[PDB]
Amino acid sequence: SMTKVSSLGYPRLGENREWKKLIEAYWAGKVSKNDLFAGAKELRLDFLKKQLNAGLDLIPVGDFSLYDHILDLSVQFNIIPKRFAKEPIDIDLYFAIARGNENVASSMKKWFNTNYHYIVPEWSKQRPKLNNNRLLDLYLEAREVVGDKAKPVITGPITYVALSTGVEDFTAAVKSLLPLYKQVFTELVKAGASYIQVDEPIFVTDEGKDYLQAAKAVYAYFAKEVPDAKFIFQTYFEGLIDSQVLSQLPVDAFGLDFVYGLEENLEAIKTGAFKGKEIFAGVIDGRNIWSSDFVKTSALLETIEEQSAALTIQPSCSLLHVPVTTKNETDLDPVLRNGLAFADEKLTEVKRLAEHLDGREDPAYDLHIAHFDALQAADFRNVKLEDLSRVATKRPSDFAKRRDIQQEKLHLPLLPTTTIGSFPQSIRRTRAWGDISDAEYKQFIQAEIERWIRIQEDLDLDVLVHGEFERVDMVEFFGQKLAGFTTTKFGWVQSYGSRAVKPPIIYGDVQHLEPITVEETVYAQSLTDRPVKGMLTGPITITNWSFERTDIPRDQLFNQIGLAIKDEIKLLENAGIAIIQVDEAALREGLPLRKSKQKAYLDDAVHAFHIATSSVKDETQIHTHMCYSKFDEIIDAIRALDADVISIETSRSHGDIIESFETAVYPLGIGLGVYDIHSPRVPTKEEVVANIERPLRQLSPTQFWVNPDCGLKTRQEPETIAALKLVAATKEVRQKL
Ligand SMILES: [Zn+2]
Numbered sequence: 001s002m003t004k005v006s007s008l009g010y011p012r013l014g015e016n017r018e019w020k021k022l023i024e025a026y027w028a029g030k031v032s033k034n035d036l037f038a039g040a041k042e043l044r045l046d047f048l049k050k051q052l053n054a055g056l057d058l059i060p061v062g063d064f065s066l067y068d069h070i071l072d073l074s075v076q077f078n079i080i081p082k083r084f085a086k087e088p089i090d091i092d093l094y095f096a097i098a099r100g101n102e103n104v105a106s107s108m109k110k111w112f113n114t115n116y117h118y119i120v121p122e123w124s125k126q127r128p129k130l131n132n133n134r135l136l137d138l139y140l141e142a143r144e145v146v147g148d149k150a151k152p153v154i155t156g157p158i159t160y161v162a163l164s165t166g167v168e169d170f171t172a173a174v175k176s177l178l179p180l181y182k183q184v185f186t187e188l189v190k191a192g193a194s195y196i197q198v199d200e201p202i203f204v205t206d207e208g209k210d211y212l213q214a215a216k217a218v219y220a221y222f223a224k225e226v227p228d229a230k231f232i233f234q235t236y237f238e239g240l241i242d243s244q245v246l247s248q249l250p251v252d253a254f255g256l257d258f259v260y261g262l263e264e265n266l267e268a269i270k271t272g273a274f275k276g277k278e279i280f281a282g283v284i285d286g287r288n289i290w291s292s293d294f295v296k297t298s299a300l301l302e303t304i305e306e307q308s309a310a311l312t313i314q315p316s317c318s319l320l321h322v323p324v325t326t327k328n329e330t331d332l333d334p335v336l337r338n339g340l341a342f343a344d345e346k347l348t349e350v351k352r353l354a355e356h357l358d359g360r361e362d363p364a365y366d367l368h369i370a371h372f373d374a375l376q377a378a379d380f381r382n383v384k385l386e387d388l389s390r391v392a393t394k395r396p397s398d399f400a401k402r403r404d405i406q407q408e409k410l411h412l413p414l415l416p417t418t419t420i421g422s423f424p425q426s427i428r429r430t431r432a433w434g435d436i437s438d439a440e441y442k443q444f445i446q447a448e449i450e451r452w453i454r455i456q457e458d459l460d461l462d463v464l465v466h467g468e469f470e471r472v473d474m475v476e477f478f479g480q481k482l483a484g485f486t487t488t489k490f491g492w493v494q495s496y497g498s499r500a501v502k503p504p505i506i507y508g509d510v511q512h513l514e515p516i517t518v519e520e521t522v523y524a525q526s527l528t529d530r531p532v533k534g535m536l537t538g539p540i541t542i543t544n545w546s547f548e549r550t551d552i553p554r555d556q557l558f559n560q561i562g563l564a565i566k567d568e569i570k571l572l573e574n575a576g577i578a579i580i581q582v583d584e585a586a587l588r589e590g591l592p593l594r595k596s597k598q599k600a601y602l603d604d605a606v607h608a609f610h611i612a613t614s615s616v617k618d619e620t621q622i623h624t625h626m627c628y629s630k631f632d633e634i635i636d637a638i639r640a641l642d643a644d645v646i647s648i649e650t651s652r653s654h655g656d657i658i659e660s661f662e663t664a665v666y667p668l669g670i671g672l673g674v675y676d677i678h679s680p681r682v683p684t685k686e687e688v689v690a691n692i693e694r695p696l697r698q699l700s701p702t703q704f705w706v707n708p709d710c711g712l713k714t715r716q717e718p719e720t721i722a723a724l725k726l727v728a729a730t731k732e733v734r735q736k737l
Contacts, residue, residue: 003311003354005056006280008197008234008255009063009153009318010047011343013492013500015325019043020498023066027095036091040066041141048145054347058151058195061142062135063318066091067098067497071106071119073160077180078129081106081122089131098497108496109163112201112237113593114287114321115503117496123166128176136187143192151195152188153234157181158211158218159202174214178221185226197232197255198222203246204238204261206595212245223250232280236317238593239264244273253278258300259285259316266300269307279308282316283353284346289322289491289505289547291341292349294356294369301357313354319343323491323502331489336507339375342491376551380484380508386563392614393607395642399668402644405618409578410531415692415706415734417727418463418671420625420647421535421581422711423452424720425469445470446523453527459724463531463579463705466524468713474537474583475545476504481516482564484508485546504546510560512567522575533623534572534580536565539608544586555604562611569612573620581623582613582643588628602637609641623647623671627710631660639666647671649709651683655694662698670695673709675723680715682722688729696733706730 012019022039025031051059065072083103087093097106108117142150157177167173202208230252239261256265281304305311325344433441448469456464471477479485492500525532539561613622624643650657650672674691675683712720
């Protein structure tokens, strides 16, 4: 009949990141409060109009923020860090919590498994109370533009509390918030609201299973206290846990993710559990950038419609997690661009899906399938790659046998010193080549490489790196020369505060075509007698940082990339580079939300790592760096990698992170990060030696390397040089044998 379409949220950035410019200009004291709010109002009415014109029946209002949607609630609900208690509650206090001012900023955490970061609330003695009418104002504003189509959105109490810190008693904290939400909801209804989106994504997670009863209590409360509201129990990022129980919640509608929770939610509904309820079906991928598979999606929608009292079509999650629009991506090949969909294009998609379901005829529907079909048939999605059956997935010799061979070639001292690869980048001004001969740019880079070689040689580091001055991003630097990769001109996505990323797109089969890092590495090696490490990026980081294809399985993509890394590695080795390092920084973000699904992921990663590194000679030393804190869960996978040396970050834990390696009696090489690289502070000589010796408690000294926690690209040069000089701390422990 008449199928509604909606959306959970929308980006704040604006087509050209004007949002970013506005607020960064405000912090710099370059924008008055008046222009700040007016600027933000312009953006909001703009976004509301786009969504209106797209045909949405329920338009999300409330998710727009000047920094973070969790921070919004903290300030609105009076959950203000103790240290900020005496400050007037206004926009300046708001940004002080987000950024610090006397007082440090609140901490941020990853928003579930996305690349977005929220601001962690800090609970204490102060009682919750409504400090403003943030959401009501936004609602009434929206009404003037879109009318009864305005749908207020907000993060629910249960998720909010679970995402917080300092909470002593979970249920008491939740309960204290109920009256606030009640008034908020009551006012909204009085102002004309009917449907209200209430985000409880905590109920797609393992931790969620602890809060099933709270959910029943909390939402029985709302149904009783605000009977006229049509609540949408909104979830996303995975399937609904304990669907059979949660489906009994006294709400008018459930928001289910059929993109990242397809199997679980599809079986949840096949049960007929939602037959008497309305389903908000998240059928459009809200955190990837591919035009929908219409045949697949529409078929799924029919199945959902038959198993519900009512259906509203929307994306799987807020459009916050994708770029704004493809309309100005003019560098793209038409067949690709026509098969791409960013936020704005998804609004159009959701509308067309609803009209097809209602039996309306639209030429755009089949045309969309035509463009989709053209993409799948593109030559770049049909590249003939290397036959994997002829690729080594294990090295000819075991760790033991390789260690001697490598030791006999390298003759490295006990507790060798080295760095993770990157040095401070002063030049970004030079990189303006704008226009400037490639020869000048290269001469410039090579000059800076030689300079840090001498530095390293004077610090007396045992294994040198070139500095990666030529690299602005550890992922895009590789995708630039790999087939199947592309970059966008304007595809920015907010990560935290005013910071945003422009992820590369993996649109076709990945294939190594030309040397990517060889020139710089070889040149560094030609300047010193000391071993120079090669630095590459692994499949985990590459796929996690990029927008990957969804038309092939994770493992297939991973293996493709592995082959590419193998090919690069072969070039490096042929050119005489004897120590090669594979960098992985996104394991924390790449690891699936559900524990039960994490092994298959790690398995895939381990295999792709073997594909990449098993074709080197036994004398070639393979290192891998992994940005990670907790190793207790994945130590099996790590041993499985069979890396000659894995460099880990221990400084923050004073080496206690070695624990998991101790219990597992890890036999392979380990690099000990003994200095926090994210702090401008220069560690003490005693602070470092103690950090090195802790891991020497049980495991043999012959297994360890000494190095900073991570790359030094973020740090300044002076503190870096001093911090590295450290080598003395290493030389000290070596002295006392
Ligand atoms: Zn790291």
